[PDB]
Amino acid sequence: PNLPPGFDFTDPAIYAERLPVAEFAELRSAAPIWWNGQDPGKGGGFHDGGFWAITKLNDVKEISRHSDVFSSYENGVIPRFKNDIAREDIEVQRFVMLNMDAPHHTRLRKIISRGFTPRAVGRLHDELQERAQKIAAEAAAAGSGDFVEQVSCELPLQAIAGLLGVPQEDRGKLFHWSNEMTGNEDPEYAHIDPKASSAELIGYAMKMAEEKAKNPADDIVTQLIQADIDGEKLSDDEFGFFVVMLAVAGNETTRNSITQGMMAFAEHPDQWELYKKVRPETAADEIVRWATPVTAFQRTALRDYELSGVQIKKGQRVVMFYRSANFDEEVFQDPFTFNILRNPNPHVGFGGTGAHYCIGANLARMTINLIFNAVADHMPDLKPISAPERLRSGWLNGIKHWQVDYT
Numbered sequence: 001p002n003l004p005p006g007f008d009f010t011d012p013a014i015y016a017e018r019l020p021v022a023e024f025a026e027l028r029s030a031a032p033i034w035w036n037g038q039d040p041g042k043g044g045g046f047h048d049g050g051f052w053a054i055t056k057l058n059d060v061k062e063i064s065r066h067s068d069v070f071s072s073y074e075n076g077v078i079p080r081f082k083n084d085i086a087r088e089d090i091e092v093q094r095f096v097m098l099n100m101d102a103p104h105h106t107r108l109r110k111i112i113s114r115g116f117t118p119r120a121v122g123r124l125h126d127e128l129q130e131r132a133q134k135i136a137a138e139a140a141a142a143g144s145g146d147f148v149e150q151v152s153c154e155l156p157l158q159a160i161a162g163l164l165g166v167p168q169e170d171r172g173k174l175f176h177w178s179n180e181m182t183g184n185e186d187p188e189y190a191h192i193d194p195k196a197s198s199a200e201l202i203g204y205a206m207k208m209a210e211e212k213a214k215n216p217a218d219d220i221v222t223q224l225i226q227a228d229i230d231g232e233k234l235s236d237d238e239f240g241f242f243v244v245m246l247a248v249a250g251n252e253t254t255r256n257s258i259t260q261g262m263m264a265f266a267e268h269p270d271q272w273e274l275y276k277k278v279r280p281e282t283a284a285d286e287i288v289r290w291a292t293p294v295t296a297f298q299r300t301a302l303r304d305y306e307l308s309g310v311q312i313k314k315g316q317r318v319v320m321f322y323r324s325a326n327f328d329e330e331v332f333q334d335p336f337t338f339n340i341l342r343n344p345n346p347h348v349g350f351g352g353t354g355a356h357y358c359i360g361a362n363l364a365r366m367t368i369n370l371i372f373n374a375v376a377d378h379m380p381d382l383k384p385i386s387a388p389e390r391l392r393s394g395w396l397n398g399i400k401h402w403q404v405d406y407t
């Protein structure tokens with residue numbers, strides 16, 4: 001393929017400036033599964049010499065489905081850390097469900113599903129609606145400011161807090177910890193210590209579990225820590241690792257969908273007009289497809305496997321570029337058209353279907369629909385003041401800041 005020498009699709013230096021859309025498109029055309037070699041010292045924590053770049057949606061689906069072969073546990077699913085991260089700090093990720101394989105994953109996911117039933121998520125609708133409206137009214141009253149801080153940031157965190165029944169008086173500290181827990185190599189956050197924030201949140205969560213045991217109530221936390229028919233339940237530490245996971249799975253992901261959804265609307269005025277008029281809930285999936293907040297997650301081959309004619313060898317990493325897959329010309333009609341009515345919309349923003357498919361997908365969609373209804377209600381004529389500031393990360397597609405005029 002026509003790419004520069006030394007080009008690495010996980011290079012945070014790229015994402016600090018842009019999404020490598022042309023480069024992904026080149027791979028889908030010329031080399032849809034392509035060895036992305038990595039130079040000595042430049043492995044983002046992985047010292048294996050590179051990985052297979054996976055760029056087509058059907059290949060992402062196949063990997064995701066064949067979790068018996070393609071492991072989350074072996075190397076974790078984050079494909080890029082600081083180049084000099086200790087192996088121990090990669091392996092500690094195995095304490096959360098995202099980086100577990102069956103049978104351990106299977107047990108935990110069955111327990112955790114208690115928190116993500118249609119009924120459980122539905123119970124959050126009304127409070128998240130009220131919150132969304134307030135957030136939007138407060139931003140409008142400010143006149144202008146940072147859209148990320150004023151509009152995108154709070155609702156995802158309030159969704160997590162509502163799900164867990166976190167007391168109001170505890171939400172400030174919970175949000176502070178949660179906003180420091182996703183690693184990046186952005187100079188703006190170089191002083192932050194994810195390890196400390198994570199240890200604090202796990203302490204808080206474990207205390208919550210021990211209290212809920214003594215004082216059972218009708219809520220999600222009680223359901224998680226009380227034995228089901230099979231005696232299955234989260235132990236306190238497992239509850240702690242569940243909360244830590246949510247702090248990093250359900251926070252910057254939804255936040256970035258909201259910011260980039262609004263960026264797409266700013267760029268596509270006809271779609272924004274249509275949105276304001278009919279408020280189509282299909283908008284949430286097109287926003288997730290367009291935003292692809294997780295650019296890539298990886299897996300490791302536990303055995304040799306032939307994927308679309310390419311021999312993947314035992315021990316090798318495959319990196320699923322959801323950002324490429326979501327613009328796959330073979331799956332979508334006019335992928336580079338932003339169409340809030342797209343239906344069906346079989347995007348892989350929430351992963352390929354399979355064992356690890358995003359458990360929060362419907363919570364995320366509801367969050368997105370509620371905040372954009374609020375933005376429509378309170379700031380229908382908002383316009384950007386300056387360009388978004390992107391996050392320096394090799395796997396998260398983030399917007400740090402974006403100045404907008406709500407009037």
Ligand code: HEM
Nearest residue numbers: 097098249250253254257350351352356357358359360364
């Ligand atoms: C637009 C926002 C979101 C995006 C783009 C997103 C994306 C993803 C992706 C790509 C995965 C991995 C899927 C796979 O490997 O097949 C995932 C897993 C997960 N997500 Fe989401 N997510 C979002 C919102 C949320 C929310 C709001 C929550 C809960 C509050 C959540 C909780 C989880 C959890 C717990 C997992 C791990 C599931 C497992 O390993 O079994 N996510 N998400």
